[PDB]
Design a protein around this nucleic acid. Structure first.
Length: 253
RNA sequence: UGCUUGGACUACAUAUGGUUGAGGGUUGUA
RNA sequence: UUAUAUACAACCUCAACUCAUAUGGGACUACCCCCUGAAUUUAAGCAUAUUAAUUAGGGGAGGAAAAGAAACUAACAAGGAU
RNA sequence: AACGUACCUUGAGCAUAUAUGCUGUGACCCGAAAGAUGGUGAACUAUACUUGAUCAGGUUGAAGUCAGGGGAAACCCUGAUGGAAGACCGAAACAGUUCUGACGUGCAAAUCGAUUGUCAGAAUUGAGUAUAGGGGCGAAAGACCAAUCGAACCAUCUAGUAGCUGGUUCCUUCCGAAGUUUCCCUCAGGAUAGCUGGUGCAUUUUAAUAAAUAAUCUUAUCUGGUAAAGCGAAU
RNA sequence: AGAUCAAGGUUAUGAUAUAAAUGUCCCAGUGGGCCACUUUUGGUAAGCAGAACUGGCGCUGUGGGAUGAACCAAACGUAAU
RNA sequence: GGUAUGCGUAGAAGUGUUUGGCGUAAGCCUGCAUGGAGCUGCCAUUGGUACAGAUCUUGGUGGAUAGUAGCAAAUAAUCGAAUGAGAGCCUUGGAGGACUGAAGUGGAGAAGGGUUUCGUGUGAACAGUGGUUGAUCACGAGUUAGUCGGUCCUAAGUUCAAGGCGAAAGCGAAAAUUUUCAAGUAAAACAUAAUUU
RNA sequence: GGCAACAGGAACGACCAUAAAGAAGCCGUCGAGAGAUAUCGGAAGAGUUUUCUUUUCUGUUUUAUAGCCGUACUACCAUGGAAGUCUUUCGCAGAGAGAUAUGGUAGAUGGGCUAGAAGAGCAUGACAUAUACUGUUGUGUCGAUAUUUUCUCCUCGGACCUUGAAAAUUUAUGGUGGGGACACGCAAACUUCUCAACAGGCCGUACCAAUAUCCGCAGCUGGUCUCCAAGGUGAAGAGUCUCUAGUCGAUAGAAUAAUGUAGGUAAGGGAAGUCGGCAAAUUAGAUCCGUAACUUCGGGAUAAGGAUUGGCUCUGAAGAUUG
RNA sequence: GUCUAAUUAAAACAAAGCAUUGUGAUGGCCCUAGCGGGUGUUGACACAAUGUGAUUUCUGCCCAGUGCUCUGAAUGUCAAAGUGAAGAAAUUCAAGUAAGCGCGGGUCAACGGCGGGAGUAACUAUGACUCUCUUAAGGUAGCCAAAUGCCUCGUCAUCUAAUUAGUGACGCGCAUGAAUGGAUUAACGAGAUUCCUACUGUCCCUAUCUACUAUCUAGCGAAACCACAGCCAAGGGAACGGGCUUGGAAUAAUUAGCGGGGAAAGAAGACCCUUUUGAGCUUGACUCUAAUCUGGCAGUGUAAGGAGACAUAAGAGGUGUAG
RNA sequence: AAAUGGAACGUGUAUCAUGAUGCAAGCUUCUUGAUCAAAGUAUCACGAGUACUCAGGUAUGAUCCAAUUCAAGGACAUUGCCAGGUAGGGAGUUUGACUGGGGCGGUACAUCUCUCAAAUAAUAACGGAGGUGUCCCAAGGCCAGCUCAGUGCGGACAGAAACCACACAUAGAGCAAAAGGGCAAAUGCUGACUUGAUCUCGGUGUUCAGUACACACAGGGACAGCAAAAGCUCGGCCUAUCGAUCCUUUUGGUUUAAAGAGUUUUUAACAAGAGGUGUCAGAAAAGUUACCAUAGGGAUAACUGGCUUGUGGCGGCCAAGCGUUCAUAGCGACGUCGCUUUUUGAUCCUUCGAUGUCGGCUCUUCCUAUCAUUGUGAAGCAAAAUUCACCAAGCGUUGGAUUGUUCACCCAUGCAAGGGAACGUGAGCUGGGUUUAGACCGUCGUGAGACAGGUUAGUUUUACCCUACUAAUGACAAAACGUUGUUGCGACAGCAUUCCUGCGUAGUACGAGAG
């Protein structure tokens, strides 16, 4: 037997639950309702806020509700260069300037987008973190399927009616400065989750880790596991195609 | 109407009945 | 009378009610009915087997319960619910 | 006709009491480390949340700023200001380095004393919560999860099993051993024969008011290749 | 190789007989042995290791060897001589 | 179970004992002592049937030592008086010399405690010395709220209409679907209206 | 009403809607006041008198709630137009998107007055009354210096791949429709003004909070969250000493052997001791000088190595209001 | 910074930095009996899995083995189901045969690995060179008697009066070596080690003063342990006696010490061996298993086209002597 | 679940010669404002109260059609059931015995031969030398014929060369193989012919329990082979060359059964073989634990004590010698004989319900196997210096650098620096070495983890008992006789002093001088 390993103990909850307390409330696009489906709609952007845990600022845009008398406040992923008191024009007949949202059909190839929709109407899934964006690389008038290029480089074929906000998302690129200390990684993660100080599993005892155990810190078995290899064995370099120093041909084609 | 002190009632699930009903369910007469 | 332009009357399906009247949820544990189900042990080791179709069970009843009036036995000179 | 045999050769059994033995059951008594079924714990400690409170005094002197001074410029040189930092010495606190000091039937089931480590942070703490046992939590020691942890605690299964240890309670009278053989996942145990006691029974001119057995010598007769002898017999 | 008759002297070494013969209960325990003469193998030796024979100790007291599991005498009901 | 026409408050069992014997022994009889109500011999048949051991069980007791180890951290008390059977205490009161030394050996609260609180008494026990004193013992008392708190709100979380699931019990349930699954309004007709999952 | 900032005794919430308050961490921070402590003055009473000391000491206080004045501070308003740039902070903050100026508005958390305030009451100190529940005299007054030795208010900052609760409850304003709404008045006013009646239930409330009330089997040197906080010397909530409160309770007497546990000193030598300088010893605060290898240029560094310091009597420098 | 509360605070963990891995949500890692969830209020500057461990300077070669992946050109293995055939049937046979495996490609900042012998330079020595045998590649930059070197107290220099220690070099390195990271590295360390000053009772070599004990007293008062006990030498014995045997000797009751014995007390030996006793851990152990992937069947429908013109409407072929 | 899919007027691009045709297309983009709740419109209520106060409803505004809330997939995924692969993530369990501890080795685990084995037979050790797990259609059977190792003399090419050839030739040859027996008109060699290497029933020998396999043997029955016959043959000239149950299998009856009855398939039964257990009287089975555990063991190691001596250490006999000459002043080759047991082992006697396991520090005493000192002897002894030997344990036998070590070597002292005993001495200390748990390297392992390799950090308890010892008081009685004091005596026990140097002696003796 063993102990249940640490890789297995995160899917269960308690001390590997997210710390979602002061989070400002799930940034999404507005719902693809009617105004975005025939014309457009205008709302100002009242504040920029930093969600505690996030990496990119969020925008508190609020529009008018068209069928009720309410002002409907909305959190958006802020594209870069969005002051307060800007008018954002979310809809189909809007024009190309940042960060209006408009379906992929209207905006022309070569543009760069963010907070893109994956399935047509689902409020904003792809390319949402700071500094990232997705270029619209091509179109098709046959069955309306637009190729975008996502931040991994993998070129997806989304359909051509799902909304997206034009412009590269504000707050980048922040991964370029060293954290430098361990009490800046303590602070980085105390509002995200308990991916702790992560101990190396080669230094545990042979009960709690596959890699762990010996008289020397060493693996001995291979660190590339199979894909289907049955937690808590699937540990280390899962399902690895190649390993070692990649040279040149990282290129995603 | 304001307060006090006493009483009576108000749980869910269900069966038959009662009462108001709902439906581009199914027809009928206007 | 059904462009979802009103009403009527039925029926079906379905609601709601501090509606009128009713049941239901005990808990006991020796026996009883249905489940669910080990390992100690034994094998002079041990893995099927054994424990045991049993401890732990674990829901449901009665004064008993369950059963029960042959889709039964038998091969005879034939028997006859449980 | 031959071989076979748990069979027959004119019935001896059935019931029962007791003693001994062999086997099944708690099995003469007490004794495991363990396995399982269902429960109870985060009042201690680990971690995470939510909400509160806490840390004398100094020491250093980042950026930013201000004025002089040198320069064709580039830009530099000096004096202040300023008050940064998982920076410094240290109090409270939190920790526990050395003395291998005290103590060691304690003051204490981990404390006492001087000496040390940190001290504004990956800080220390309360309260409410959250995670439960082949599970949790872990800046990782198999650490901690109520003085319990290379698997908590509790009750039961259960009087688990034990080829091993310890014991096994009156007195006289009679007889009186074995440590060997064969087999065994057998070598601290069994089975198995030898040795033992009991209880009979049959009976003798070696049994009851021998012209016949049996075990040391003699006789007669077989066998033997050791002591001695031998290499002027073989090898 | 047998089945019945005929003849056969004095029963065919010695000394022994605490009785022998035979079943059952293969009933209890035991299945660690040690010591010694002579024989003997391994070891250099060993109060070591392993066998053959007989006797002992184990189970056994008493007399002797000052002393002692096995040596030498001797085996043990209570007493006198 | 039968028997001894047994023994017994005129003294049963038991217990003690320099009572006296019997037995090879296990044992047994008997006198006296104490005791105060039951008991034995024999023939059967039986049993929870005999102890020196088991680091045996349970209770008691010895030596040590019946008074030995010891009652040594937190600087420290001393006078005289009153008590009182008895005073090194704390018993008290006056002098008193000292300690803590405001990050106290100070004054109050949280958790915890549960009457320890406070008067009047007081013997034993307890207070590892004593004790007249006591957080002890005995007996009487004592906690007063519109304003201080709870109560009210929601946090993490408990997750909780069964739509669901499971043989059930029940459920590592940020449900994500459960007709109105609504929280609703002095609101008109011909299910009050944009509305709230 | 006021040009305006806004102002007054009230002056269509019944909804829909929007905004705000509730609603806040951390570290530092100019300034305001409180509280304390502190000198020098009045008073009133104690202390001390070897000798000397106009001494050395205590005491002098004003709760909520209100009324009014009220000004610092920050930001707005009006007139106005700024380079020869001026304003201003410890700190670099501002200004043609209106500076400096002159006048004003807002906020007052800040105090000063006066109600409370019966010489409130209190405190002190005289008396006086066998004495009880006592009658009574007289005081209570000036200035000033100091620290987050401590709270509170205000200001501006700082760090951050950290950016620092939700709801109850409250309030304002905006809105359509609806109500109030005569002028010869009678009035009204969930009136968001003033005044008056009445009521406010349930439950906790003693005491300890630990060298003796708690947990550790105990009157156990351990443990167990907070609040208040004096004088001295000093950088200091340090260490020694003391004031207010609090204790002398740790079984007591005699005596001072050996070995000890704890603390001192030791000639000469100075690590020879020892596994090893373990243990001890040395140095240490402050001012001034001065400082090496190496370096990630930041440090090293308090490197090293030196000098100074008491007491007494003097001199010089640093400020404030008035000129 | 952090850990083994109650023997180890360290060089171990962590850490920033570096790098490899998976994943575009019908997803990746995870939990769940089942339903459903966690990351996730998430979206490649993100979540998840590892290794290395700041900086600097670097990171050689090997894809034979084991893994891991592949868009893998897939006749060799080959499940059930469906399929054909033989039989009266059970049944037996044959084709076909998915994923894996087999074959094949890629990867080592995946697990790991990283050679021999011979001959030679006008003195010996050494071998730049040469032969040659093997292998996947033969250990490259580098460092080193290393906390890593057996031999070893290696050899040389230094530090010393003397050094199995330290240091610095040398390198046929039993058995160094490059993110199993190599060589360095300033600052920092209750870390390991060496030496020089300073300083001393550590020592030569002990002495004395203090306090509290112990001591004696009054009061109070345990425990451990205990076969019976406690004078030796020698002998013999189960081979180290208080007891036996032979001597030596042998006199009460006691106080403070002491640490020779009692093979002294604790404690059914922590090592070791046995037990057909276990438990924790591993893994190409035997045998199972969750989850996973893969095939089949079920749910499971309506349309067209191509390959099947099958069962079928209907059509057509015939030359040996002779005739 | 808010505006889905149509169509329609609307305006424009565009075409067709004012049409139709296909498309755009019906309103919000300079600005941090604002919007909810119908205006208008028409027709009816078109009136009520009564011009007078006061009024609805519908569409329109805001076009009609058809519902599928809308999307994205979609007869796939998901799910049910089966099947294949995968799977130390998890589970259960195993991981031989023997053995001069265990492990490693090895096979002494089944079996055979000679020896041990001590004259029946039996007999043991991880005693000695070997063997076996096969081989053979002839190497089995049988009848006949011939004789082998070798040596000797001869013969063209002919030595060792072959091959022919005559005499000798007791097995010195051969007999599948180990060893032992055995065999000469064979059991050997060659030739003939062969299948008895078959079928059946019991019994005996061995092993022995006096059980089974297996091998062998003596027979009965049957069928055969060779041989003229007698006879011989039931494998191998004899002693090794082998394997249960269960299951699978095949061959055999012209088989028995399937239990309601018939026939056929099938299955089973019975008999004889086969498939194999080598750990061979026969489980189906990998490691590790320094994180550990229990039952035990002195049946069993590490540790003291005992016994033992290859090793350690050791002194006499005899002299080949060396010693210039000279054997023995001093040594002494090859021999030979004894002595000690602290190491090294050897064993496994004692202890595993525990004897604290290295050293050092401290402190005692004892032993001589004499280093120095006292007393002497000898010398290849002139003096000095030294060497040999005797009586001798009285007094000594040091300070330090490195290392945990003991011996160790080195500096220094010294006219001159012996060796040992309770493996002396841990409730004496210490804790440096080894030696639990932490951690790091190097090697080894796939790994857990290992290492008679290195490094670091690692809890050292109790005396108050008896005794011994050290000091301190000390009675009753007893007594060659009271109570008390004073002054003594010694039996007995202890026993302690020690070496060094300087000046004289004297530059003397001695020597040639140097000394």
């Amino acid at each position: 037997m063993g102990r249940v390993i640490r890789a297995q103990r995160k899917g269960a909850g308690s001390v590997f639950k997210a710390h979602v307390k002061k989070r400002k409330g799930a940034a999404k696009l507005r719902s693809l309702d009617f105004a975005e489906r025939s014309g457009y709609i205008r709302g100002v952007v009242k504040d920029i806020i930093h969600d505690p845990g996030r990496g990119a600022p969020l925008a508190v845009v609020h529009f008018r509700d068209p069928y009720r008398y309410k002002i409907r406040k909305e959190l958006f992923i802020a594209p870069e260069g969005m002051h307060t008191g800007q008018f954002v024009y979310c809809g189909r007949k809007a024009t190309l300037q940042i960060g209006n949202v408009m379906p992929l059909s209207q905006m022309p190839e070569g543009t760069i987008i963010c907070n893109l929709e994956e399935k047509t109407g689902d409020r904003g899934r792809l390319a949402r973190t700071s500094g990232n964006y997705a270029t619209v690389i091509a179109h098709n008038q046959d069955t309306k399927k637009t190729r975008v290029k996502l931040p991994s480089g993998a070129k997806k074929v989304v359909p051509s009616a799902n909304r997206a906000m034009v412009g590269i998302v504000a707050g980048g690129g922040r991964i370029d400065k060293p954290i430098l200390k361990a009490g800046r990684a303590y602070h980085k993660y105390k509002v995200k989750r308990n991916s702790w100080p992560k101990v190396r599993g080669v230094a545990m005892n042979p009960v709690e880790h596959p890699h762990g155990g010996g008289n020397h810190q060493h693996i001995g078995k291979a660190s590339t596991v199979k894909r289907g290899t049955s937690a808590g064995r699937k540990v280390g370099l899962i399902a690895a195609r190649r390993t070692g120093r990649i040279r040149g041909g990282k290129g995603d084609s």
